[PDB]
Amino acid sequence: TLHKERRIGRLSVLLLLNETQVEELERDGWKVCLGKVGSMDAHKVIAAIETASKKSGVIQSEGYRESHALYHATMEALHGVTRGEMLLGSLLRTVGLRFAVLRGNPYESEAEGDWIAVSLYGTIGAPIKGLEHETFGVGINHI
Amino acid sequence: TLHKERRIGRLSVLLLLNEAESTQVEELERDGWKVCLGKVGSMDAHKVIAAIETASKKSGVIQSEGYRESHALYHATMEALHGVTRGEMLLGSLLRTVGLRFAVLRGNPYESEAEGDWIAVSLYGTIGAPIKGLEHETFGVGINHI
Amino acid sequence: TLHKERRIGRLSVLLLLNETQVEELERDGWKVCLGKVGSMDAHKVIAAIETASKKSGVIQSEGYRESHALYHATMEALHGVTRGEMLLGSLLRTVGLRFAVLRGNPYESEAEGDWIAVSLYGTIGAPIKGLEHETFGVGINHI
Amino acid sequence: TLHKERRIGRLSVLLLLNEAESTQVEELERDGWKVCLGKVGSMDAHKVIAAIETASKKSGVIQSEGYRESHALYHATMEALHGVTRGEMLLGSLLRTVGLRFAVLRGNPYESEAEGDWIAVSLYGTIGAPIKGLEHETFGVGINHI
Amino acid sequence: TLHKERRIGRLSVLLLLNEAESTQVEELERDGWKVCLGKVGSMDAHKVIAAIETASKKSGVIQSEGYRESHALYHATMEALHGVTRGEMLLGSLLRTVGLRFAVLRGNPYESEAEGDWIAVSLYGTIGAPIKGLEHETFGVGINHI
Amino acid sequence: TLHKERRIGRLSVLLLLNEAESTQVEELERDGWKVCLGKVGSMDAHKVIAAIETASKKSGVIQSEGYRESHALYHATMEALHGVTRGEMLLGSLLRTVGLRFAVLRGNPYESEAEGDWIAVSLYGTIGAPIKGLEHETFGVGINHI
Numbered sequence: 001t002l003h004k005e006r007r008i009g010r011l012s013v014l015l016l017l018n019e020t021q022v023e024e025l026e027r028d029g030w031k032v033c034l035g036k037v038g039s040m041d042a043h044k045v046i047a048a049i050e051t052a053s054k055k056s057g058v059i060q061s062e063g064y065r066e067s068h069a070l071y072h073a074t075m076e077a078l079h080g081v082t083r084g085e086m087l088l089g090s091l092l093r094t095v096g097l098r099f100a101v102l103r104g105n106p107y108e109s110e111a112e113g114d115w116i117a118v119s120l121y122g123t124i125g126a127p128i129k130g131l132e133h134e135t136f137g138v139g140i141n142h143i
Numbered sequence: 144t145l146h147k148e149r150r151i152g153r154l155s156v157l158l159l160l161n162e163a164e165s166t167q168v169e170e171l172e173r174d175g176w177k178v179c180l181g182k183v184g185s186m187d188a189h190k191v192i193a194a195i196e197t198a199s200k201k202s203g204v205i206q207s208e209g210y211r212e213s214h215a216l217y218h219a220t221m222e223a224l225h226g227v228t229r230g231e232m233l234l235g236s237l238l239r240t241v242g243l244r245f246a247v248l249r250g251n252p253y254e255s256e257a258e259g260d261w262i263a264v265s266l267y268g269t270i271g272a273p274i275k276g277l278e279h280e281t282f283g284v285g286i287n288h289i
Numbered sequence: 290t291l292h293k294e295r296r297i298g299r300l301s302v303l304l305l306l307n308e309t310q311v312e313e314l315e316r317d318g319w320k321v322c323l324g325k326v327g328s329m330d331a332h333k334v335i336a337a338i339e340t341a342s343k344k345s346g347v348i349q350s351e352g353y354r355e356s357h358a359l360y361h362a363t364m365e366a367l368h369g370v371t372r373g374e375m376l377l378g379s380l381l382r383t384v385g386l387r388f389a390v391l392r393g394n395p396y397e398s399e400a401e402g403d404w405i406a407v408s409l410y411g412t413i414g415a416p417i418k419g420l421e422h423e424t425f426g427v428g429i430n431h432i
Numbered sequence: 433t434l435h436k437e438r439r440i441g442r443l444s445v446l447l448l449l450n451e452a453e454s455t456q457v458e459e460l461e462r463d464g465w466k467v468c469l470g471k472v473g474s475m476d477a478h479k480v481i482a483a484i485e486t487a488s489k490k491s492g493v494i495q496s497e498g499y500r501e502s503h504a505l506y507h508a509t510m511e512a513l514h515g516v517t518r519g520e521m522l523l524g525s526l527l528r529t530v531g532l533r534f535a536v537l538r539g540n541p542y543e544s545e546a547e548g549d550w551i552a553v554s555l556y557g558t559i560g561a562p563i564k565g566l567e568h569e570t571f572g573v574g575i576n577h578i
Numbered sequence: 579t580l581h582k583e584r585r586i587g588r589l590s591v592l593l594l595l596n597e598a599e600s601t602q603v604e605e606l607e608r609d610g611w612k613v614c615l616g617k618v619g620s621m622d623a624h625k626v627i628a629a630i631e632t633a634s635k636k637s638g639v640i641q642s643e644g645y646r647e648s649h650a651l652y653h654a655t656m657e658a659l660h661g662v663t664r665g666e667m668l669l670g671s672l673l674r675t676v677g678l679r680f681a682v683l684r685g686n687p688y689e690s691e692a693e694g695d696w697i698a699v700s701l702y703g704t705i706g707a708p709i710k711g712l713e714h715e716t717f718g719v720g721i722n723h724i
Numbered sequence: 725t726l727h728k729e730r731r732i733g734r735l736s737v738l739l740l741l742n743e744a745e746s747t748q749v750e751e752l753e754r755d756g757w758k759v760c761l762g763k764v765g766s767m768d769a770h771k772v773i774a775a776i777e778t779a780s781k782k783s784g785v786i787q788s789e790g791y792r793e794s795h796a797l798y799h800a801t802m803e804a805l806h807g808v809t810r811g812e813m814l815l816g817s818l819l820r821t822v823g824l825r826f827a828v829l830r831g832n833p834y835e836s837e838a839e840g841d842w843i844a845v846s847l848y849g850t851i852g853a854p855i856k857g858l859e860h861e862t863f864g865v866g867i868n869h870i
């Protein structure tokens with residue numbers, strides 16, 4: 001059962017859209033990461049979220065287990081951004097994204113352990129400036 | 144070019160995530176924005192499409208008669224369900240259910256008036272098993288022209 | 290190398306859209322089947338094409354090999370009709386379709402054997418009359 | 433309701449499959465139809481999207497300036513590539529190539545003028561390995577509102 | 579680094595395809611593996627998932643309480659179904675059915691004791707028309723951290 | 725009806741996972757099966773496909789000339805890749821790579837001599853980040869009539 005006050009998905013988004021909310025979240029038991037990425041190569045958008053998440057202390061740089069949790073969460077977020085085909089550049093479109101990574105327990109029971117949320121917000125469009133609209137994605141996984 | 148003050152997607156989400164109590168709906172409307180808000184919980188994805196659709200028709204978000212409007216919204220709803228289902232646009236057949244809250248926002252988000260009106264379909268809620276506690280959050284935003 | 294005069298895909302479509310072209314095609318070495326299907330259940334659209342194909346002599350009712358060839362071809366056609374999600378009814382949409390099945394060799398070499406083409410044309414829309422547009426699909430497989 | 437005389441999809445295909453030599457383009461145009469025709473062969477799917485797009489811009493099928501037009505056509509091209517790729521919208525990364533012919537038709541296909549204008553993207557050609565003979569036919573039709 | 583002697587994927591599959599007075603489930607358990615075997619035949623995916631989840635909770639492979647382990651086993655099954663369905667995670671609605679045998683394995687397949695527990699869902703059986711003899715083999719394996 | 729002794733899927737997989745002075749390829753060939761084994765590691769799907777196709781044509785599993793058998797082996801590989809990629813048939817473009825071992829088997833797995841020849845492509849290895857130790861097992865099997 002989700003704890004009304006710690007819905008990690010909702011929080012990672014509210015954090016992503018508003019222009020230190022991080023301090024507040026960190027004051028509560030949240031591990032938080034933030035970054036920007038503009039690319040037409042999905043692997044760059046993925047490598048950046050991983051690099052940022054490991055740089056800050058959101059997930060362990062050592063081992064595979066947390067990288068697995070984060071990778072799959074990003075994949076679930078990239079789904080909301082690409083809507084059907086997980087392709088950017090190859091389908092003549094590129095993204096300018098802002099992302100947010102949260103790690104912690106969103107449930108009432110302490111036995112649920114930590115979970116990780118990957119959130120993406122920005123524009124998706126043609127390889128030109130004024131040719132795009134908003135794109136959103138949120139990935140949630142157990143870690 | 145886009146607007147810092149009129150990003151239909153961002154806005155539509157803000158309204159979706161906020162519980163109370165103030166009227167963020169009044170603000171958007173007063174500002175040339177057609178807005179809809181409803182909540183749907185189903186094991187059938189078609190019920191979620193119908194729900195949003197109908198509400199978008201009662202509240203003059205889109206036109207009740209015709210198809211051109213109902214079409215731009217169908218794909219918006221669809222593109223919103225991708226973020227929600229992430230891969231397989233299936234719920235009950237995949238032993239999963241959704242408890243959702245939705246927001247349909249219609250209006251032009253561009254600096255240039257020539258871009259015409261657009262519509263966004265944002266979704267939020269939970270996705271998990273048929274049983275109550277087992278689940279986590281699920282998000283989805285769809286932006287179509289109209 | 291395809292034989293300019295016997296492009297099975299092109300022929301199954303030209304046959305599907307025009308209001309006996311079948312006789313002519315049959316006069317050449319083509320096995321042809323025709324039918325109509327209106328449904329919100331994909332399995333019905335699939336079972337009809339199979340039933341029609343076996344009734345007429347397009348494929349063998351006996352055995353699995355030809356049913357396999359036809360099933361996969363229909364699946365490839367259903368892709369063009371559903372565009373992304375192979376769902377009709379469950380995604381609040383239904384179809385009224387006309388289909389065409391062709392069997393024969395479309396290549397210059399006789400060693401290419403027979404191939405089978407599944408073609409679909411009609412409307413895809415809401416569970417209401419004047420709320421739809423055209424949908425098309427063509428599946429091609431070796432048999 | 434639809435028209436027996438103005439089904440943008442059916443028509444767009446007829447023009448695509450016919451080789452000569454008469455001018456079926458003259459007929460459609462004379463009858464309030466924006467029409468485009470080109471051929472593209474690529475191992476890169478983006479080149480097929482660009483090709484159709486650009487031609488639709490040179491020939492005033494859609495508007496060169498703005499986005500609202502370029503958007504309705506992108507999804508049409510996309511929905512057309514589903515019929516072509518059938519599952520994975522990939523070509524070269526899946527060791528396959530396409531030799532295509534495309535037709536972009538813009539105009540209203542409904543009995544009621546209120547439905548506004550629509551655009552269809554039909555594709556036809558071959559899909560097979562990089563080598564010449566190895567391949568079979570491939571078809572795809574995309575219909576978006578605009 | 580995957581400990582060459584404890585490759586959870588490979589083992590679960592070998593168990594799955596083994597015709598054997600010789601219990602392999604015994605060895606696997608003597609060694610720290612929690613093992614579960616089953617069989618479910620159906621034209622409904624949600625029944626296969628359900629069948630695997632219930633067998634897993636009854637035997638001790640995963641916890642009956644809490645979401646965490648259920649979430650882990652769910653996505654793992656999902657990934658195994660991908661191999662079985664190859665494209666469209668649908669059975670009856672695409673006029674096809676499956677007769678599966680299934681293994682679920684839990685343990686640490688790595689050298690480092692920090693990797694913790696992982697889980698593998700493995701499927702093997704047939705897939706084909708509702709009619710008895712028209713079908714061919716199908717296989718699927720999903721691995722996930724738990 | 726799948727002849728219990730010649731289940732092409734199961735065999736190809738067992739061969740794939742077998743550590744063995746004991747050649748199984750021998751028995752399979754003594755019995756009418758055309759067998760091919762290989763290994764390809766890469767972050768490019770088109771290389772895996774290519775690798776399988778070349779090995780298959782060099783050894784005699786499929787004809788080097790004509791499209792028919794190539795078309796058969798192509799879709800079969802495609803279906804096997806689905807299990808390996810589970811959702812997105814992409815490797816490097818999704819920051820991941822695979823180290824596969826592969827078997828290709830050709831023969832009639834049915835009782836009736838009319839079913840003719842069928843073909844199975846089976847894959848097993850790892851999938852994970854470009855960096856050495858971060859990965860887990862992956863499996864895939866595609867069956868098709870040839």
Ligand SMILES: N[C@@H](Cc1c[nH]c[nH+]1)C(=O)O
Nearest residue numbers: 092093124125126503506
């Ligand atoms: N609007 C498109 C992206 C795009 C590319 N070019 C123009 N638009 C989408 O939904 O992804």
Ligand SMILES: N[C@@H](Cc1c[nH]c[nH+]1)C(=O)O
Nearest residue numbers: 238239270271272649652
């Ligand atoms: N975790 C699943 C939903 C679910 C099904 N059962 C339990 N949870 C998802 O991401 O959609």
Ligand SMILES: N[C@@H](Cc1c[nH]c[nH+]1)C(=O)O
Nearest residue numbers: 214217381382413414415
């Ligand atoms: N036009 C939709 C179908 C639909 C259902 N309801 C309205 N439209 C499509 O592309 O499939």
Ligand SMILES: N[C@@H](Cc1c[nH]c[nH+]1)C(=O)O
Nearest residue numbers: 527528559560561795798
């Ligand atoms: N047959 C493949 C294309 C192909 C690749 N290589 C040979 N043919 C398809 O249906 O797309």
Ligand SMILES: N[C@@H](Cc1c[nH]c[nH+]1)C(=O)O
Nearest residue numbers: 360673674705706707712
């Ligand atoms: N051969 C089909 C199953 C099937 C349906 N009808 C006949 N066979 C598959 O690969 O899923």
Ligand SMILES: N[C@@H](Cc1c[nH]c[nH+]1)C(=O)O
Nearest residue numbers: 071819820851852853858
């Ligand atoms: N675990 C991923 C592969 C991966 C990419 N990065 C790390 N691991 C998969 O299931 O494909």
Ligand SMILES: [Mn+2]
Nearest residue numbers: 068072721860
């Ligand atoms: Mn993984």
Ligand SMILES: [Mn+2]
Nearest residue numbers: 214218422575
């Ligand atoms: Mn549509």
Ligand SMILES: [Mn+2]
Nearest residue numbers: 357361714867
């Ligand atoms: Mn099959």
Ligand SMILES: [Mn+2]
Nearest residue numbers: 133286503507
């Ligand atoms: Mn778009």
Ligand SMILES: [Mn+2]
Nearest residue numbers: 140279649653
């Ligand atoms: Mn989940």
Ligand SMILES: [Mn+2]
Nearest residue numbers: 429568795799
């Ligand atoms: Mn093919």
